[PDB]
Symmetry: D2
Subunit: 217 residues, 4 copies
């Protein structure tokens, strides 16, 4: 895909609401699509000012499968989708009753990916790890990719690691949709590593890095 | 509660996104809080103009427990919450993988309830009853109300009725939060009846009526 | 149904396994089918002798919808099923990860119902309310009955009450199957009250009483 | 572990019930614990004689993590558990409402593993892929292993492949328990490949082969 280059840039805008707390997020990043790597910086602004009111890890995976190392031969559902574009829809089902839904659209112009997202979380326990900001990051995961009714689906039982060492389970279910039809891949898996680093005391300024590789299974 | 009168008015504003379709909804209604009844009219405006793109029934229950007939003696968690206000958070888990989260805030001034909500739905099958607008309304339900960690929770296995007569299951889980502490009720049940009537071909203009009664169990 | 009389007797046999603990249960009871009431006594024998190793409340609802007061006119799916017989299948999804599946068969001879069941529970936390025997009984419930693919289904979000006053959620999903076709009822609800009383220190000897009424909704 | 040799034998006995159909299974196999491979042959006998009444794939994963290639250094939770023994508990949550629970115990004598299991399935749609025997086998999976409350847990979103090419989702949740404490492993993943081959028309005689490797993640 001549449209996707070796080095790309990214810009992000998110509108969200978590447990009734409204916020917006702005971000910028750079990545190497073929290498499967990317790093970006974000700034969260709570509607009522103030420090980030919940764990940023619930938002991290919302902030682009084009950044996945695929074997050259294998149909790359994500890279093939550009320049037309793609949309994503993800359900996050947490083990303690919190649930979040997120949907986003990605467009491309030149070397720049514009990512516009909406995030909504509800029912997180007021003293749980999300609202109390007790998480440290996601454990490395293996997301199963399958085709269903013409679109690619991703499923993974993810684990958010906690400050003292324990874990908190979250089932992810995602629909990856292309604007135009592309050659479909066979079922496969995407291995991920994502790291979150707070840049300020409040957690409002944060950096994220993801490494992802696709494996023929 | 002198603040809640025999006849009240309502005004609504919703910002939402379903399967990537953005929309806003405006509405107005009237109700009898002590009788447990209310009727309102809504207008949905799709971001891209055009007929309503999905079943309005997924939004109906988002558009106020003050409209519940409670036995005079029983603590009325909802009526007691005013004038301070209340917030609601609901998870809708559909049997076909669609999930929606909704959160809203209700405030009161005089005889007027202002209801401001956010709705987000994802993963609904493109040919399922929601996206294909094949539903007719919710079957009468019995929502169990229980207290958990200081707030009232509502749980119900709801069924959306379909055009040909079949049913489509949806589990509802809701947190009912008050701005200030109120006397808590014992576990109980709220029986509901809700009717949706389209006023235009597109389904963009719709009327809703709900009847609800609380039963000591 | 001349086959179902005003006063009936019951006999029970259960083979089960919970968290690897094998056990069998024997029981006897009496009830008034038209009144919707019944009381029975059980004896649990653990494969390894010893006191009952888990909360009997997980088994209680397994130990007959013929004991439901139905309005004379309404199709009684359960009473109509005899003398041919019925089979039941129930999934219990607990909020802490424990899950139990149960299936049973009921036959009738004269005034006697023979109930033969199988129960299997797994993944209950070793220190949770089930394994630590911290429950007191089920809160009164409203089970929604719907027809799906030719059989009657029952759905309810049940709550097991705990020793200190809290609650523990369990979603029940049941298929009610008849040996021969019967006239189907419209969707409705069955209201229940079930009480468990230990007769010995170990909880191995226990009495259960259920009251159930069907409501046209 | 001197107790686990390069070549081992296996014998199996299962008592089960699926949608009210009782059956028993007997089996024998051979495997290479360190290589992560094993092959066994089974014979299912339905209580009422007759061909196997449901997809054998729901039982396959019930029929031993000692057969996993682990890097020599990494704590092998499963091999360390012998000679004392281990017990397993697994919840299978199918996307169409069917649910199965299974629990089993494995003991060792000499080169022989004895595996005794109980299987119970309910609520599978009468015309679904399980009851209609429309499955072909499990897609290759990546099971996440995490430690929780002192025992190892396995989680995976598995997919059962169907005769025409489609897929059927099943979430697996398993507790792996040792009879005595062992050194715990860090969170990791087990990659699996399992193949089922019918040896008779009815599917009552079947062979299974599994290859599994643990990856440090």
């Amino acid at each position: 895909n001549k449209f996707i280059g070796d080095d790309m840039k990214m810009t992000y805008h998110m509108d969200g609401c978590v447990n009734g707390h409204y916020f917006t997020v702005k971000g910028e990043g750079n990545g190497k699509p073929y290498e499967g790597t990317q790093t970006s910086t974000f700034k969260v602004t709570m509607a009522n000012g103030g420090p980030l009111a919940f764990s940023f890890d619930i938002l991290s995976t919302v902030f682009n499968r084009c950044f996945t190392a695929y074997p050259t031969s294998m149909p790359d559902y994500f890279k093939q989708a550009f320049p037309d574009g793609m949309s994503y829809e993800r359900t996050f089902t947490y083990e303690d009753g919190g649930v979040a839904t997120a949907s986003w659209e990605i467009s491309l112009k030149g070397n720049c990916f514009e990512h516009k997202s909406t995030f909504h979380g509800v029912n997180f326990p007021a003293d749980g790890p999300v609202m109390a900001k007790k998480t440290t990051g996601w454990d490395p995961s293996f997301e199963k990719m399958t085709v269903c009714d013409g679109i690619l689906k991703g499923d993974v039982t993810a684990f958010l690691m906690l400050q003292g060492g324990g874990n908190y389970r979250c089932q992810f279910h995602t629909s990856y949709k292309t604007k135009k039809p592309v050659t479909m891949p066979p079922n496969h898996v995407v291995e991920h590593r994502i790291a979150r680093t707070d840049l300020d005391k409040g957690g409002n300024s944060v950096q994220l890095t993801e490494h992802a590789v696709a494996h023929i299974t």
